[PDB]
């Protein structure tokens, strides 16, 4: 692995640290409890949900969400976080060499299909087997509380926890995750791409650095790179199933609303 490949990896890592407000080293510090005796607030039932929502009152009242069903309020807040992460992913993509040179239409296409694969990959960093951090690591919503919601809402996050537990067993660090997210965005087989050749060359460059990076950083996990190739396939299927659930909610839940940036992404997706 030559100095040029090491540089590209370190620059992708910098762009990741500079654009994402949360990362795995921070999340594991919080989840471990070994750097402070003041843990995040735990949302584990309706009462502690409502207590947390006293802090979030301005976010809820902003869009007149405060009197909706609990399930709708929870996933309103979750959507707001997805919008933030899409916005960050867009800045991160612009820092990937060659991405900003692409046809603007292709940039939209890559982000349209790539952002949720990257979202659920990175979401794994803030998850453990019992719940997930929220509000920039300041809260922790339990997996069992989410499972206790009424259908369909109880079925939204559990498959993401299932994915995250196996993904986290790979013990990736942020230097790995930054290249993995770049590999997810720079994908040559998204529908509707206009310059598939230019993109495939970008994809090859990133996947090559990703492979050599993993062989250097995890020399004892010999087939980590093929494992991660499978995880990219798994994420595509996870997002397909997620988008089908978003469609069910739209058709069955009249009191729930979809943020307009997320409308654009989901419209005509799969």
């Amino acid at each position: 692995m030559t100095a040029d490949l090491k540089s590209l990896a370190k620059r992708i890592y910098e762009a990741y640290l500079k654009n994402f407000n949360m990362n795995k080293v921070k999340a594991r510090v919080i989840l471990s409890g070994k750097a402070s005796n003041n843990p995040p607030f735990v949302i584990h039932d309706m009462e502690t949900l409502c207590m947390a929502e006293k802090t979030l009152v301005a976010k809820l009242v902003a869009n007149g969400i405060q009197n909706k069903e609990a399930e709708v309020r929870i996933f309103h807040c979750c959507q707001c976080t997805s919008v933030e992460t899409v916005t960050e992913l867009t800045e991160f993509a612009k820092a990937i060499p060659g991405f900003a040179n692409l046809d603007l239409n292709d940039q939209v296409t890559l982000l349209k299909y790539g952002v949720y694969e990257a979202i659920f990959a990175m979401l794994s960093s803030v998850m453990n087997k019992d719940g997930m951090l929220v509000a920039y690591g300041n809260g922790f919503i339990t997996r069992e509380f989410l499972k206790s919601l009424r259908k369909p809402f109880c079925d939204i996050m559990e498959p993401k926890f299932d994915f995250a537990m196996k993904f986290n067993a790979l013990e990736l660090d942020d230097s790995d995750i930054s290249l993995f997210v770049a590999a997810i965005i720079c994908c040559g087989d998204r529908p509707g791409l206009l310059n598939v050749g230019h993109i495939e060359k970008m994809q090859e460059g990133i996947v090559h650095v990703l492979r050599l990076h993993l062989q250097s950083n995890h020399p004892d996990d010999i087939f980590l790179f093929p494992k991660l190739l499978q995880k990219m396939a798994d994420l595509r299927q996870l997002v397909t199933e997620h988008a089908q659930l978003v469609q069910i909610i739209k058709k069955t839940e009249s009191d729930a609303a979809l943020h307009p940036l997320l409308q654009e992404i989901y419209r005509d997706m799969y």
Partner: peptide, 13 residues
């Protein structure tokens, strides 16, 4: 791109 106005705006900032 006409159907992704918000995403299109983010990419041009």
């Amino acid at each position: 791109t006409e159907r992704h106005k918000i995403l299109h705006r983010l990419l041009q900032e």
